[PDB]
Amino acid sequence: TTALVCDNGSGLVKAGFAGDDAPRAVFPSIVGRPRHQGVMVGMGQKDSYVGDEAQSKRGILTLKYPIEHGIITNWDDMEKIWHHTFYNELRVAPEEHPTLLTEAPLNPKANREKMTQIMFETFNVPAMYVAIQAVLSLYASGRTTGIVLDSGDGVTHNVPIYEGYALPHAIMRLDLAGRDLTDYLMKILTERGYSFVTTAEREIVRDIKEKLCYVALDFENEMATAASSSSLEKSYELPDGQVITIGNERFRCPETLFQPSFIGMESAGIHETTYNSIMKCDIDIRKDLYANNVMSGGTTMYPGIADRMQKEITALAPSTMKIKIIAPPERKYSVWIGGSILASLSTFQQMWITKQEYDEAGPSIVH
Amino acid sequence: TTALVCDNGSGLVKAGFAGDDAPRAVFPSIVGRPRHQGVMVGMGQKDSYVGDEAQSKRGILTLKYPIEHGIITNWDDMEKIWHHTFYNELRVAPEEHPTLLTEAPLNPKANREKMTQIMFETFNVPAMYVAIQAVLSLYASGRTTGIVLDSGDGVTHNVPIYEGYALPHAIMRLDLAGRDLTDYLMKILTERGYSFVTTAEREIVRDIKEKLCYVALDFENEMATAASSSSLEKSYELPDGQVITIGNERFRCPETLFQPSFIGMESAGIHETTYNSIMKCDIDIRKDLYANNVMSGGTTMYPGIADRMQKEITALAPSTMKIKIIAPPERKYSVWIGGSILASLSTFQQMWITKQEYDEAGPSIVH
Amino acid sequence: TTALVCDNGSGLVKAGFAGDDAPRAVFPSIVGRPRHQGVMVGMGQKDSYVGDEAQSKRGILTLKYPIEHGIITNWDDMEKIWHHTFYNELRVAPEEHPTLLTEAPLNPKANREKMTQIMFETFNVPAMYVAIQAVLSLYASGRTTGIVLDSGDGVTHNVPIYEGYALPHAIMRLDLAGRDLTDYLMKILTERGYSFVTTAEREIVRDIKEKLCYVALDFENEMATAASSSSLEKSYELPDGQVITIGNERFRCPETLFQPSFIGMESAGIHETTYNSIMKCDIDIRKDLYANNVMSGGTTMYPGIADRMQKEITALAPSTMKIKIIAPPERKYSVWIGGSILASLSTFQQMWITKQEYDEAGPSIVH
Amino acid sequence: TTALVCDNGSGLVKAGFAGDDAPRAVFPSIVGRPRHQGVMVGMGQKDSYVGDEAQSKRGILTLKYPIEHGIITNWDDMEKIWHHTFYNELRVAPEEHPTLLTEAPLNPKANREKMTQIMFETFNVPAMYVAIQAVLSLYASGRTTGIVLDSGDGVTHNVPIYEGYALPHAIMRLDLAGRDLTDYLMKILTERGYSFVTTAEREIVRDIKEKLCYVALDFENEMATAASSSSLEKSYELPDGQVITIGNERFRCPETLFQPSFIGMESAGIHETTYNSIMKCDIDIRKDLYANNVMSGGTTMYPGIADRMQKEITALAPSTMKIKIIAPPERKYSVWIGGSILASLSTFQQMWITKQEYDEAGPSIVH
């Protein structure tokens, strides 16, 4: 019977069978719809495109992320991506597997309840479970204690975890993420003259960000040395064939995680939020958290991030103590891996919510 | 029941039954009327001649193109060519077939509405459809994606088409075409002393253009080598028996498509309009358009055209990317072929406008 | 009711009933008046003689052609020849037949109007019509397209005709004809000593011309070979019994048609005027005219004419194309035959000008 | 010493002395160059025409906007318009005045730096300043708080401003403007048969737009009532003397600001961008912005615009709160007025960039 593990973040769906090393289907959470009413016969007609297929045809389509900052915005679009996921990639009847789904912490109750309702009623599932992302990543690490920073496309979290357990009062979410950074890279990019106005172009700049951008160790020194352009400008080539050259924009895009004032947010940088989260925890356990802080998610993938974190958190925390930061490679799939390994635990098998139990207890029992 | 496919361009009517490889009736859109009041008895009297028959007797007749730059100028003349077409070549009662008609994009609304009105009221037709030329040519290519350059006698278009669909905001029409080029060849030809003042003589120079003229790869180099006349002068023989020798006029006639400043137009050459049309399209799809650009129509028939296009568009577009130009032989009949194949599609059968539906909905439903 | 066809050229009247192969009455247009006041009793008295009767008595009479170069010179004389024609040869009341009359193209308006006035008022005719000669000859040919050269006694024409119709702007008349040639043969003949001063003798030299004169293929070569007189001198016998021997005068008389400089006219030869007439026509139709050029009239009867025409026109026109000259035997009566066949066409019956229509519309309606 | 205030937008330069009610020189930003090489002697020769002078002679000239979407495209052309501006209209040595220049927000850095370089090096200026347009318009309003929508010929902005200050993260620019609307009015106008292909004709249609076009309160209802043409068709007269009659094209041209899908852009209408800009601002201040939203620029001049804005923004925003829209007359000159009043403030006198300060600090100090 095994299980399905579906990691539904903004920007990417990662899904696959439990007990495996990596997700088989990994595609963008997008629902493409034709921008221009098309006059042909035999075409499509394909009123709605989804996932990688939508990526193939961006210049026709308006791309629409169904899920924004972890919150589901458009429910039938989400349903569409699930249906496509199950039948067109994993090729499976949901009635044959229990399904573990994912969600961000501190996330409105409507997502869990609606989600489960869909999984039971529209797809028919024997049993399912919805899990907090950071815990899954911590399992992926193979560790029981630590503070997880999970930055995906929608949202960034800090969840401190001690010896199992958890500290809900110290959990801190922050809407800064690949989507916010891509938009910021948009408007900063436009100062070189390169105008990317459209949803489809947003995905191009996402690609630019993913390849070229890095996190500087020291910001203003790097900005100073951007004066005499040497290695800092890099050439990137668009799908059109045009050449973009980007210098300080390469590293000032991700600087926004440390300085959210660039987007005009008062929220403290990710280092201050991790630090702050540690502060909120009991005096006894802070040393372990500082030692053991973990990173997850696509927005942790910028080269340089861990080193800057180690500088900044060390600058905030008492110097007498060791702050090791653990950011393993393959960290973008940590959540999914966590899901897999959890589904492979027998002790967890009692915790699935059964179809019948949902039917008799109602929606309130997901929590 | 089959269908009729009528391609009504300026200069030539191509018409025939659907599902066939080529149009059966192909004759000039001309309405000849005697210039000189003729004194005989038993003659004609034949107040109006039409089509090839008018071609047979040019020296008596004033030839009159009913259709100018795609726009219908003289409606009863057009009606005459249709009536002659149906009864004297295709030999068919229009009440027995649905009829697919053609038109240029971006063309005044009066042509569709009046045209349909005539087809329903004067001829009686069970159902009909009016189609954009470039789409038909694209079907003739057997392809779904590409940018069509269709240069006929009246008008030249660029219509970009992606994966079916269409981009109306990037559609670009241009009045440069076999008629404009024939007149330009007139006045340039007169510099050798050869005076062709009359409508009938215009058709002679059209013949000269069709046979002899070619498009140079590089213009000014060829003009330079015209200094020492070798292969560039060619002898042509008129119907009278006189011999014309034309050198640089051979290739400087079609150079006007690339340099409309020869006619005193500010419009950019056809290569700049194709390039410009590609620019107007979304950054994602431009690579396909550059790869896939298609040619149609009689004014694409000059030897050398495709090679010059490949030079010039390559000179405008980023060198990193492949610009294949597809100009198949039999391209002059691409539109008609496209019409045939579309009429042979069953999925299109729903889209005919029915006689009764027109009667109840009115003229506004053609669009 | 049938019709009468009256071909009134200078030198001969040809008249007869329509629908017949040849004119019944064919006699010279002459009005003889006694030169010498005659003293007898019972004689004549016959103050005016007309036609063949005048021919019978030339030595008494002064002969007077009423019609000169197609233009009527003396109206009552013309009336006399008509009256004699109708009552003394055709033996018919004009009130019983419509009457088709003939005239040269480009001929003063006074001839049509006066002529019609006479036919309606003096003779009483139910209806009549006046026709351009060359068209009648073209009907006689049984053809619709061609360029007619009609050389009679008064005038020579070229009228190009295409597919019915006509080209008035290319019609070319020329006063060179049997009368001019007979006078030229007079003065050239006098170099042998043979003096023919009188009107009556002019008719004798007309006979000489009609029998003996021929058109040389090459002129100056024939003149050279006239040096050694062999076949070129021929003996002719006058009515008196005297013998005339004429050598180069035989062929240099008709050479005047090709070289009007012999009479001191600047007008180009008949071959240049036919060629010139073709030039004036639209470039399209010239090939048909060159193929189809027709000959009519008494002054086309010289042996050798067609062959010289074929040489000379071929020398002027582009060699690439075939110039067939059609000069049928019985061509002297082509105009009359044409008239007959036209009168036998029913479609022409609407075009007669009725007595009453003339009465109410006036003289201006003949044109 | 006073100051010069130069508002350099696409389509119009507005310039004048500071502290005055209106700009003295207001002329189009165009650089006319003869299309046809002219053969006269004493003519011009005038290789380049500029401004209103170019407007005087459109039919000879190719008109060329030097500045496109706020971005300077052709630098020497811009220099030419400045030189003409200073010496031929304002009649002033730039060395005698500090000069305040204008620019759109979010505009490539090349414009500020190059612009300043030209002003200091080519013209010699004691000091200068470059200002964001929307702030100047807000000063023109005489108000400190509000959200400015400035639609010129090149670009449209939204800049929210609270109690002085500014919110750069909520600034939103959009390339929809009089130029885009004129081109759209071109292709929509061509459906009536009226073909305007040339740059010179573009200026004619700009005139049509400026006089006749209005913004409908409700779109599709007005389109429905366009069925029975009454007041909606209006006659306009071209400079040639021809009469154009335009019905629904009158109001569907400016509908593009609310529905950029007409041009094939995915960008939300101006009402959604203003609404969106308000959303991006802190929850506290939105009420003031909704109350206080200001309009500027030539493309705000369509009759009906404010009323439709009030409908649409009210439809998006919570009904409980008052949305006053302030669109004062003389709003096309708001930016220039703003510039004047700012230059008349003494407190601003410290902020000029001095010639010497530029010389020692370099180009980087403009920002």
Next chain:
Amino acid sequence: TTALVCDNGSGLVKAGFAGDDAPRAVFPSIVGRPRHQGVMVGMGQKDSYVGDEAQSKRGILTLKYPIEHGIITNWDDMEKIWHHTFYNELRVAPEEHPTLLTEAPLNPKANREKMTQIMFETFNVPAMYVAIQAVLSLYASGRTTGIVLDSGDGVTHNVPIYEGYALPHAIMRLDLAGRDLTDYLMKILTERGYSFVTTAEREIVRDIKEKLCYVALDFENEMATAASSSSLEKSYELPDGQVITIGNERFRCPETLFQPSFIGMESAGIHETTYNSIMKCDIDIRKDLYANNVMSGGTTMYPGIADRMQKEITALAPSTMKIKIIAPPERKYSVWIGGSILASLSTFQQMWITKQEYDEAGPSIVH
């Protein structure tokens, strides 16, 4: 040094020194050659006569226009008229003056190159220039903008000129002119019985045309009133002493300019060609052209022409706008005057083609 201005049109040479009010030598371009080989001793012998001298002796000579429809037909004849012009009227060594020559627009390249070759090689000239006629006439007007209609003996032009400059694509030539009109007056004149067959008589009818013929305001009304002959018949006296009376032929001769169908040409009347030329020009400038249309040349000299033009062009053009026609007296010499004034401009002195520059650059540099 001054200059010579030689206006070489068909029918008349106008030549003189530059900077003068009128040409000194004005005589017909004819090369008379004796028709009849003359037997005297001491006579002539004068194998070739030229100009006014030939006019003195028409009845002996065959007159030969060397130049036909602007195109040089017979080069040595033209050379003869030039040589006679320089030595026998202007009495000048060409080596002492630069020489400005004239030619029709749109005229075969052979005329410029051969002409210049003769002027440099046969006559020896320090420098020369060949000019388009209509521009010269426009200078004669003292104006910079306008559309010139120049009708000479060979050819009629329309050249639109705006603010200096020129529009070559709107230049329209037409072979209708005093020569065509004189021949048409020939064949129409022959309907009264007056036969003029010879070149010498053609010049007589040219005189008739020049004195008597006028252009009717309304054609068919005047033809109707020709029914009752009052003032419309006028008596003219030939050099022989005979009296010609011509009625409707007086005004129907020049009606051919408005109705070229009289000669069997499909070309539109001169009013349609002026109107058509205006159409071809950019929409901006048409109002000036309509206001400013100029007339030049001998074939503009018919009384009534300007008024009929004003009627007909007003009937074609939109009524809302003023069509002033400027036809100054002395307009037959406008071209020559233009030439004079141009030669008197110092700015033009750079544009002469020098003997040496021709020698080193070749013939291709005349254009």
